[PDB]
Design a protein around this nucleic acid. Structure first.
Ligand SMILES: [Zn+2]
Lengths: 95, 120, 116
RNA sequence: GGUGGGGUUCCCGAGCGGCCAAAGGGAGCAGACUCUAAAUCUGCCGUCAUCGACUUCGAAGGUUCGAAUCCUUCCCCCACCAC
RNA sequence: GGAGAUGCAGCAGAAACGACACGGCUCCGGAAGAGAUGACGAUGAUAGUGAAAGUUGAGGACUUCCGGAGAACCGGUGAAACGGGCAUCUCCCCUGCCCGGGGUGCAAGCCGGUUUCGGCGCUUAGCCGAAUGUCACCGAAAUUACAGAAGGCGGGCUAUAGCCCCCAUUUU
């Protein structure tokens, strides 16, 4: 099962996602699934049919699990998912 | 108190299973390059985690190119056992040809038949 | 235990064996079953659950999931071998022409009900 | 300004690219032992605390089938120098 | 670019770096069943191909095992295999340039002094108990971020203040 604690190490591809906050104004309001994932980038296919390239470190993501909705920064999702499942420890201080 | 019941290798095996299931689910649509990307990421996490492939998704992929092999579409599967028992997978994309020798199971069946002959 | 997708009841297993017994115009051996599901002439595939090595039948169900021919499982291979007409067991049987049991394989379309 | 080096468990300290391989010692807890206590021995030894399994080898990136180890960068800690 | 040596742990696989022993293939010896019988066979039969591979698919049909020796082909494993790779070390096979070779380093080294001190090296800034101060303004490159000489020069790395130039995502 996919847990909100290990979502820092679970695979993001194959999960519906929407973003709630970002510095880009037009980025806010997208909904879709995750297809491709690189070191700080998701390739998201919308339900409308548009592929978008979303950087991770500028936005916060809301991943839709089996019933759950988890809000995680992409600053926590830094690194390739290969190296992220190797081991990546990120500690963020929003002061 | 037990908070972490799932370890690193267990989530690695789950990522193997999810990525290769999504590889099968996305390989039938028409995007073989996306399925090649899934097989490439699963192979990279297999060499990284030092974990072995499951026996379900073991023979469904190609080692040379990395395309997920649909049997019939881009993979030709023929069983020949005249000289030696073998099941041959043939990649239609690049041309890499692999097989499944079954000599030792035939040896076990042969020893069982020898025991049935000697008991009778 | 590995290549099998769904649990098969014993009554529909006996219906499969009765269909193999009533048909008697079949392709036995996994090469002929594979050729029949690649051509599409087969209407029903019967695969034994006790096949060791499993690879001999491991290419069979997913290919049917590509080709849309209904497939089902029996627990014993020697019973399918006796139903096919041989003293020695057979791994898989594809049916080209059912004949008098053709309505019977309509009931084996209820295997699709087991698929969901 | 300069040379020869080191950073690994609470503290002193080893470690061939490979199964917590992580030598360990002292420490804490528990057992054993004793009238009590010291000393000796046994297991946990960071966690679950019975076997066993996972994390940390100053930090990051990269190579590799796989990093305490091999490469690069960022650091700190030593020793001694005015004559 | 070539040769030589080492390593690619553990598990798996016949086999982890040169080739091989091993199983399918051929021969010989022993045992068991059998002449309109019986053994075997859709987990594939007499059966062929440069036998990786592919076409074949049954009143098909004379077989099976063990041990020993050999021309050709083949390895369910693993990242990587009857064969080509990877990394390290050392030599010889090249091309062009330059000729003293190493070691320590200015807190080197030298002098008055003979422990300890002062002078040279030392400066179109040259301190050493480590000097280079404050304000305004043209401009817009400006004391604002990283940040400070200590004999001098040249290369490379690290961290960013202001403007200029170039490239990319969102966008329209
Ligand atoms: Zn291919």
């Amino acid at each position: 099962m996919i847990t909100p604690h290990n979502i820092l190490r679970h695979e993001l591809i194959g999960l519906k996602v929407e973003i709630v906050e970002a510095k880009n104004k037009a980025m806010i309001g997208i909904k879709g699934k995750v297809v491709d994932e690189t070191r700080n980038t998701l390739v998201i296919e919308k339900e409308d049919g548009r592929e978008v390239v979303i950087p991770k470190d500028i936005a916060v993501f809301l991943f839709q699990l089996k019933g759950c909705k988890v809000k995680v920064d992409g600053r926590l999702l830094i690194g390739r998912p290969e190296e992220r499942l190797k081991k990546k420890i990120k500690i963020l201080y929003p002061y | 108190k037990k908070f972490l019941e799932k370890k690193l290798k267990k989530i690695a095996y789950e990522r193997i299973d999810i990525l290769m299931s999504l590889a099968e689910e996305e390989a039938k649509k028409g995007n073989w390059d996306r399925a090649k990307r899934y097989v490439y990421l699963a192979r990279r996490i297999a060499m990284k985690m030092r974990i072995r492939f499951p026996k379900k998704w073991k023979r469904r992929i190609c080692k040379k190119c990395g395309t997920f092999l649909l049997y019939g579409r881009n993979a030709r599967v023929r069983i020949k056992s005249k000289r030696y028992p073998h099941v041959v997978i043939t990649c239609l994309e690049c041309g890499a040809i692999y097989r499944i020798p079954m000599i030792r199971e035939k040896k076990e069946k042969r020893r069982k038949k020898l025991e049935e002959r000697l008991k009778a | 235990a590995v290549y099998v997708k769904f649990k098969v009841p014993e009554e529909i297993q006996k219906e499969l064996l009765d269909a193999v017994a009533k048909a008697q115009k079949i392709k036995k051996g996994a090469n002929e079953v594979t050729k029949a599901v690649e051509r599409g002439i087969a209407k029903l595939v019967i695969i034994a659950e006790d096949v060791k090595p499993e690879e001999v039948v491991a290419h069979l169900p997913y290919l049917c999931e590509e080709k849309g021919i209904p497939y089902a499982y029996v627990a014993s291979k020697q019973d399918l071998g006796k139903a096919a007409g041989l003293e020695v067991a057979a791994s898989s049987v594809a049916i080209i022409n059912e004949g008098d049991a053709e309505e019977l394989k309509v009931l084996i379309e209820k295997v699709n009900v087991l698929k969901q």
